[PDB]
Amino acid sequence: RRAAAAAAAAGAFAGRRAACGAVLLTELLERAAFYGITSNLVLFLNGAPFCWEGAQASEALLLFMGLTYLGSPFGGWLADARLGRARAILLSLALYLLGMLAFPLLAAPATRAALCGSARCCSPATFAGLVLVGLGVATVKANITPFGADQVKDRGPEATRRFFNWFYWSINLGAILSLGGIAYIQQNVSFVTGYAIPTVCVGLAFVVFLCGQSVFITKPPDGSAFTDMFKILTYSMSHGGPFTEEKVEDVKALVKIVPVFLALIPYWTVYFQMQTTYVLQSLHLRIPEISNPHTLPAAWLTMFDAVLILLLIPLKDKLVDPILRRHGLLPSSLKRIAVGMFFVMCSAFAAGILESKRLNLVKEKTINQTIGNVVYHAADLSLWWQVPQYLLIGISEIFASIAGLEFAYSAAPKSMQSAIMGLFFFFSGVGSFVGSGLLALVSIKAIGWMSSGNINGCYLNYYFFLLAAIQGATLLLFLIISVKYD
Amino acid sequence: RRAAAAAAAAGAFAGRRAACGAVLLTELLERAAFYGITSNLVLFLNGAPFCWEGAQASEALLLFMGLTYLGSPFGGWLADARLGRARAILLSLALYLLGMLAFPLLAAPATRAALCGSARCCSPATFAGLVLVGLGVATVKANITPFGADQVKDRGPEATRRFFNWFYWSINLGAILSLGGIAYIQQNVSFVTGYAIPTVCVGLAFVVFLCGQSVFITKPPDGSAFTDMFKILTYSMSHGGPFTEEKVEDVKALVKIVPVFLALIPYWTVYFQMQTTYVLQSLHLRIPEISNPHTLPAAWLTMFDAVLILLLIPLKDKLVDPILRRHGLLPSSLKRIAVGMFFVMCSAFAAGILESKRLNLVKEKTINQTIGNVVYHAADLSLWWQVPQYLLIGISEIFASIAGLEFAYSAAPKSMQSAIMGLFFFFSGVGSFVGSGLLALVSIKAIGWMSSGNINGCYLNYYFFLLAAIQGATLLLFLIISVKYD
Ligand SMILES: CC(C)CCC[C@@H](C)[C@H]1CC[C@H]2[C@@H]3CC=C4C[C@@H](O)CC[C@]4(C)[C@H]3CC[C@]12C
Ligand SMILES: CC(C)CCC[C@@H](C)[C@H]1CC[C@H]2[C@@H]3CC=C4C[C@@H](O)CC[C@]4(C)[C@H]3CC[C@]12C
């Protein structure tokens, strides 16, 4: 019946198999370049060409990441009011490549003198490159996600759900490629060759759109709507009556989806802190060697999470697209976010248990292992015991990560698409920054949880339990908000 | 509108304030007597009048508890087919008082010779008394709960929801009275006076119904329905067609509510194990003294849980009857069970954290404290640190315990009321027994979690984490079952 019809829709892609693979490949290459920059920025800045202090490099990376979140709302508005999505993404990719071209030249010893030969050694060029890269990334992220789902939007709302699966899969495949191959070359072979590859990736990602301009679905720009709902918004949030035709409906949609985005700040707060502290714990756990180029990169550890995601996304798809559809289970995009939050809390609890075990074991004996150029003191507890953690968050990223994008896409006005995604990725950055502040809070002398690269004297288990409690409170609040919204 | 109407219904009781207080008082007295028997049965059996071994007394108490669960389905059937609820409860209370009269006589030194003067010293009389008490308790429990809600059933389904709140409140008040006063006298003053009081409670509970026979709502017995849906059930589970008039509907209801009861076995499995191991942990924690009669009873520790429940039930009622009704939040009786399971899992995790802290602290120093007539080795960690546990389960008993009874009452055929409650209380016993088996499982030499009254050498934290995992899996399964049922 209806189920049969929906399963038949799941039979999507179909005609448009080109228009999609192009977007998937473009996002893969863009993510590969982004992770190539982000993985080893601090090592590059604190090295031979640049004599920046560790604090300066950390602040530079923090500003670069913050720019990629702050520029998203403005990148989305530019792609809706003044330009189309295709042209905006093309301009953003051109700017991203321009910012890309700076780092290989600085890495090269011959061309470094031309740029900055004659505190910070080469602050202007590096800052300009980082600003350009951040603006390009912010404009691409806020615009590629709705542009890709535009091709599959005609076949109802299950084709856009299948597309957002292989979009996340391509993102994670690009992350694996960048953090595995490029991050290895950047630290073992040379920085020139390690930074030339992501530039070539950006160059190839630009060619794909030019080749695929004949198969994409475009929408004419419309800034009149933005003017109507920004300039004369203060004149009113509802009850337009005879004045205005249906723009009051999209004003209602905006003011109704803002609270859902606001209630998701603690989710990102916990999620980014889990990204950081999980790697912190992995560094202090027994890591086996691979050979008899040395000192495997620390970025490889992050790969672990994404390594799960790939193996889950096909499987899940099959074992979720029939199984959960013919039974009418979990159809909405908000209950899936709730399930993701539940599994985030479970992962936090598992991490706390493992950290308590590690802190109990470390009092007996400790070994030294080198990662990069620094030796960490680790207990004699195998790294693979951290596998149960990464499953639970991985399942979370199966549910909460994709469903968040689906909700941001579907529950948004047609005119302001790619601008609601801008707010989504901006509130993600706000959550990341408040999470950094939370980490700074528990590090004070009054609490002393994170008073000290060795964490054998820091109670990471209490931090994990606090994150679990925050995630539980967020789960309850989000359940209430989702019920009220529906 | 509709909300207003429902809030007005909440304005219940109203006319029937007598018919209810009578049921509440009867259940209070019955629970006081039951907890008077259960609290100190082992101490009585292993003492001066009786020279039973500890294993024999434990087996006797286990059989007594198992009888109270096994007799529930048959007690409910007797109250529906052959008798009315009022007459069945009166007969059960008479039998309960008859079984009650045995223990004071055995405790008294003069009358002990008349009963058993001339292995187990007085097995026949004690076994007969325990059998009579168990049958009486089983028949009362399966019949008092639907009889009490019968008075308030006319004013829609919010009066039966308010009644089931003050019913649980009266149960917990009776538990506090029995475990605080009676359990104190049974161990400090004398067993004769400590067992005379619950007999007087049973006697008073019998008088209340005789006084309230003029204000109760009764239903004529109907065994023809039981014959129709038992004897010729094998002839068919649906599609009756011209044969039968609407009994196929109640057959459908039975076969549709059986899976929900089956999926609740792990809930009771975890809940009873939490009842036991929480007291086990409380015994090994620093307990302050009260005076300068000595050796406060161990049963007082159980009081802790119920001590919360009282303070929650009024408050909750108010802060849930307006607040959660005008907002249309959590109206069904199964989502409340799901919330209770969530809080059970959270309590298990908190208990595991506290147990890990206690096991870390015990390695430094240990103190000795006497409870009853046995000294426990306890860490120097305050007992009140166990408060966060008992809140989380207490909230659970606010949601899962009451809503389970509401679902058992509402989702049941009109003819088989008090027989579905029999199955409810029987599956509760099945869950209790499988929980006892689970505790016996983790005590084997292969696992060794509970290899040994001192638990300083037993990993209770791993047991708590296993209970939390079981509760999470039960939460997921129950969510799926509840969605399919609705
Ligand atoms: C006892 C004190 C702590 C009050 C507890 C309130 C919390 C525990 C309970 C009470 C009200 C509940 C919410 C009421 C609103 C809904 C909508 C319901 O359809 C799905 C669950 C959800 C999201 C509930 C989540 C849990 C909840 C927030
Ligand atoms: C979703 C939430 C409720 C999960 C519960 C996690 C929190 C509330 C629980 C888990 C472990 C619990 C702790 C268990 C052990 C200790 C150590 C003791 O020295 C003080 C109490 C304290 C600190 C408890 C505080 C509350 C606690 C931290």
Ligand SMILES: CC(C)CCC[C@@H](C)[C@H]1CC[C@H]2[C@@H]3CC=C4C[C@@H](O)CC[C@]4(C)[C@H]3CC[C@]12C
């Ligand atoms: C609802 C469920 C999933 C909650 C998760 C609880 C379980 C699955 C988690 C919580 C703590 C985790 C443990 C953390 C620490 C250890 C000790 C180590 O020597 C073996 C792995 C092991 C044993 C992990 C096994 C999985 C684990 C027990």
Ligand SMILES: CC(C)CCC[C@@H](C)[C@H]1CC[C@H]2[C@@H]3CC=C4C[C@@H](O)CC[C@]4(C)[C@H]3CC[C@]12C
């Ligand atoms: C990835 C693997 C572990 C599959 C995971 C399945 C579990 C995690 C998910 C998938 C399907 C989900 C259930 C689908 C059915 C429903 C009905 C929905 O309206 C409420 C939630 C509930 C009860 C979901 C609970 C969580 C659930 C059981």
Ligand SMILES: *[C@@H]1O[C@H](CO)[C@@H](O)[C@H](O)[C@H]1NC(C)=O
């Ligand atoms: C660990 O490092 C410390 C500091 O250099 C050193 O003294 C100690 O011997 C090292 N242990 C091992 C096993 O290398």
Ligand SMILES: *[C@@H]1O[C@H](CO)[C@@H](O)[C@H](O)[C@H]1NC(C)=O
């Ligand atoms: C605890 O009990 C043991 C065994 O009787 C005893 O030897 C020890 O001294 C006791 N400790 C205290 C503080 O009483």
